[PDB]
Design a protein around this ligand. Structure first.
Ligand SMILES: Cc1cc2nc3c(=O)[nH]c(=O)nc-3n(C[C@H](O)[C@H](O)[C@H](O)COP(=O)(O)OP(=O)(O)OC[C@H]3O[C@@H](n4cnc5c(N)ncnc54)[C@H](O)[C@@H]3O)c2cc1C
Ligand SMILES: Cc1nc2c(=O)[nH]c(=O)nc-2n(C[C@H](O)[C@H](O)[C@H](O)CO)c1C
Ligand code: SF4
Ligand code: NA
Length: 509
C-alpha cells in the first residue's frame, strides 16, 4: 500500500501524488502541525484559511472515495511536524511506499528529502505539474543567460501555453500592453465573501485559542474554503472586475481596498484554483468581447509571467537567496508594521487593511509598505518575515523573490527589475491617501513634510556608489547633483531625524 502525503498548499484532487493511487489500498495523509503553523507567525486569518481549506479538502477526497488519515492541530497525539506525522502514519498503515508532491519552500523540501533515510521506505517525490515550468526547464532557460528578465521568460510561457497566441504571433500584435490613478466608484460591485460554515467556525475558534498573540484579526472571515466557492470567486472576477483590471492596476483608494483585483491568489496558491484554468477563463472572456486586450493580457502576464517566473527564480537562487543584502541594511522592522499605528496615512491604511483582511494588492505591497522599508534601510530578512506572515497568499517561493528582488532590490537586480524607490510625489499621484494625511506630499523639509520625501533622497545618497550606474536612477542622480550643498545636507538631516525616531522606538520594543 501507499502512504500519499498531501501538503496544505496542494489541495487539488489532481495533485501529482494522487496519480496511480489504489483507492481501496492506499491512504492519503493530511496534517495540521505546529511546525508549519509556527515557522513564521502567520496571520490568524491565514492559519484559519489554510486549516479550514485542508479540512474541507479531506472531506472532498473522502467523498471521491479515498481513505484519508487527517490530523487536526488539536489532536492529542499530533506529532508536531510532517516527519513526526509520517512516522505515526507509517506505524499505523505499514506502507511499502510514500508518495508526495514536491513542496514550495526550501525548508519543507529539506524535511521531505530526509524521509527516505529516516524511515527506510521508498519515497517518490513528484514534480508539481501545476506549474508551467519544471525546475529543470527553468534552469535550462536561465543557462548561459547573463541577464534574467521576466519579459523574456513571459514570451516563452505565452508560446508554451498558447494563451493569447495566433499561431506564432501574439494576439493584437504586441506581447505586452504595458499608469493612471482611479476615482472612487460607488457602482463598482463588492467582491464576493463567503460566510463561515460549521467547519470554518470551529477552525476560527481553535486558531484564536491556540494562536491568540499572532498578527491579525479574525473578525469578518470571508475567504472561500471550498473548490466551488473559489470558483465562484473566479466567476465574480471575470464578470465584475476583469474588464477594468488593466485600467486601475497601479491605483490605490482609501475607501476601496480591492479595486479591480481578482483576490484569487489565496486560492491559486493552495490548490483551490488552477493557475492555467484561471488564465483560460480570462482568455475566454476576451474572445466573447467581455474585456479589452490590455486587461486580459495584463492579467495573464501576472500569472504565467510573474508568478511562474518568481517560482523559477526562487529555486534557481538557492536557499541562501534569503541572505541577499545588497545595501548592507541592518535596521529592524518598525513596530508600526505590527500595529498600523503611524501618522503616515498611506502606511496606516495599508497596514490596517493587512491586519483586518490578510490581503493588500500588488502596488500597495510594492509602493507603500515595500517602498517604505526600502527607503528606511530595513534588514531585508525582517521585511521577508513580515510579508511571509501577514498575507493569506504568502509562501516562501512566491513571497521571497517579490521581497528580495522586486521590492527591496536586496539581490542587486538579479531577477531583472529596477529599483522602485519613490517619494510622496508618486503616492500622491497614484492614491488619495495624502488627501487625509497630516503630512504634505509637496514638502520635503519641516514638521509637515511627507517622510517619504527626504527618505527618498537619503536612500539615493547613502547608496550612491552602488546605484549611480543604474539607468532608471540617472535623472534623480542628476537632480541631486544640481542641489546645493546646504539643500543636500538639510534633506539628509531630515531623513536622519526620522530614522532616529525609528531607532529610538525599536530600542524599547
Ligand atoms: C513585497 C511583495 C510581496 C509579495 N508576496 C506575495 C506572496 O506572498 N504571495 C503571492 O501570491 N504574491 C505575492 N506578491 C505578488 C502580488 O502582489 C500578489 O500576487 C497579489 O497582490 C495577489 O492579489 P490578487 O489575487 O488580487 O492579484 P491580481 O492583481 O488579481 O493579479 C492576478 C494574479 O497574478 C498573480 N500575481 C500578480 N502579481 C504577482 C507577482 N508579483 N508575483 C507572483 N504572482 C503574482 C497572482 O496569481 C494573482 O492572483 C508580492 C508582491 C510584493 C511586491
Ligand atoms: C500555516 C500552515 N499550516 C500548515 C499545516 O498545518 N499543514 C500543512 O500541510 N501545511 C501548512 N501550511 C503550508 C506549509 O507550511 C508550507 O508553506 C507549504 O507546504 C509549502 O509548500 C501552512 C502555511
Ligand atoms: S503625505 Fe506622505 S505619508 Fe502622508 S499619505 Fe501621502 S505619501 Fe503617505
Ligand atoms: Na509545489
Amino acid at each position: 500500500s501507499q502512504l500519499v502525503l498531501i501538503l496544505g498548499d496542494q489541495l487539488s484532487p489532481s495533485i501529482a501524488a494522487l496519480d496511480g493511487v489504489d483507492k481501496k489500498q492506499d491512504t492519503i495523509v493530511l496534517c495540521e502541525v505546529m511546525a508549519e503553523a509556527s515557522y513564521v507567525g502567520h496571520h490568524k486569518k491565514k492559519i484559519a484559511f489554510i486549516f479550514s481549506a485542508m479540512r474541507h479538502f479531506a472531506e472532498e477526497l473522502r467523498g471521491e472515495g479515498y481513505r484519508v488519515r487527517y490530523t487536526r492541530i488539536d489532536d492529542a497525539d499530533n506529532a508536531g511536524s510532517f516527519t513526526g506525522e509520517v512516522k505515526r502514519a507509517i506505524d499505523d498503515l505499514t506502507p511499502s511506499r510514500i508518495c508526495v508532491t514536491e513542496p514550495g519552500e526550501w525548508r519543507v523540501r529539506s524535511e521531505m528529502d530526509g524521509f527516505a533515510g529516516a524511515f527506510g521506505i521508498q519515497v517518490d517525490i513528484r514534480s508539481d505539474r501545476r506549474f508551467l515550468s519544471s525546475h529543470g526547464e527553468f534552469r535550462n532557460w536561465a543557462a548561459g543567460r547573463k541577464s534574467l528578465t521576466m519579459e523574456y521568460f513571459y514570451r516563452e510561457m505565452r508560446r508554451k501555453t498558447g494563451l493569447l497566441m495566433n499561431g506564432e504571433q501574439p494576439v493584437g500584435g504586441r506581447w505586452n500592453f504595458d499608469r493612471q490613478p482611479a476615482r472612487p466608484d460607488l457602482l463598482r460591485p463588492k467582491h464576493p465573501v463567503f460566510a463561515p460554515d460549521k467547519i470554518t467556525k470551529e477552525v476560527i475558534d481553535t486558531v484564536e485559542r491556540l494562536f491568540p498573540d499572532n498578527f491579525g484579526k479574525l473578525e469578518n472571515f470571508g475567504f472561500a474554503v471550498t473548490r466551488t466557492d473559489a470558483e465562484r470567486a473566479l466567476s465574480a472576477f471575470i464578470d465584475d472586475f476583469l474588464c477594468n483590471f488593466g485600467a486601475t492596476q497601479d491605483a490605490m483608494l482609501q475607501d476601496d481596498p480591492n479595486l479591480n483585483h481578482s483576490l484569487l491568489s489565496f486560492y491559486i496558491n493552495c490548490g483551490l484554483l488552477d493557475a492555467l484554468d484561471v488564465c483560460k477563463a480570462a482568455e475566454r472572456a476576451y474572445h466573447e468581447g467581455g474585456a479589452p486586450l490590455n486587461a486580459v493580457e495584463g492579467f495573464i502576464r501576472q500569472i504565467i509571467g510573474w508568478r511562474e517566473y518568481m517560482r523559477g527564480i526562487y529555486w534557481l537562487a538557492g536557499p541562501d537567496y534569503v541572505d541577499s543584502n545588497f545595501f548592507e541594511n541592518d535596521r529592524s522592522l518598525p513596530v508600526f508594521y505590527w500595529t498600523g499605528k503611524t501618522h503616515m496615512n498611506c502606511m496606516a491604511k495599508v497596514i490596517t487593511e493587512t491586519i483586518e483582511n490578510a490581503y493588500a494588492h500588488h502596488i500597495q505591497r510594492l509602493m507603500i509598505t515595500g517602498n517604505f522599508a526600502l527607503l528606511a534601510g530595513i534588514d531585508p530578512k525582517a521585511v521577508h518575515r513580515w510579508y511571509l506572515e501577514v498575507y493569506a497568499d504568502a509562501y516562501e517561493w512566491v513571497e521571497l523573490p517579490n521581497v528580495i528582488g522586486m521590492s527591496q532590490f536586496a539581490d542587486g537586480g538579479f531577477l531583472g527589475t529596477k529599483p522602485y524607490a519613490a517619494s510622496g510625489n508618486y503616492i500622491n499621484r497614484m492614491s488619495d491617501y495624502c488627501d487625509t494625511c497630516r503630512y504634505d506630499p509637496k514638502e520635503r523639509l519641516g514638521d509637515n513634510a511627507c517622510p517619504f520625501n527626504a527618505l527618498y533622497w537619503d536612500f539615493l545618497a547613502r547608496n550612491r556608489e552602488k546605484l549611480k550606474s543604474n539607468h532608471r536612477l540617472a535623472q534623480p542622480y542628476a537632480t541631486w547633483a544640481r542641489m546645493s550643498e546646504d539643500v543636500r545636507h538639510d534633506l539628509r538631516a531630515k531623513a536622519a531625524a526620522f530614522l532616529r525616531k525609528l531607532d529610538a522606538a525599536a530600542l524599547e520594543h
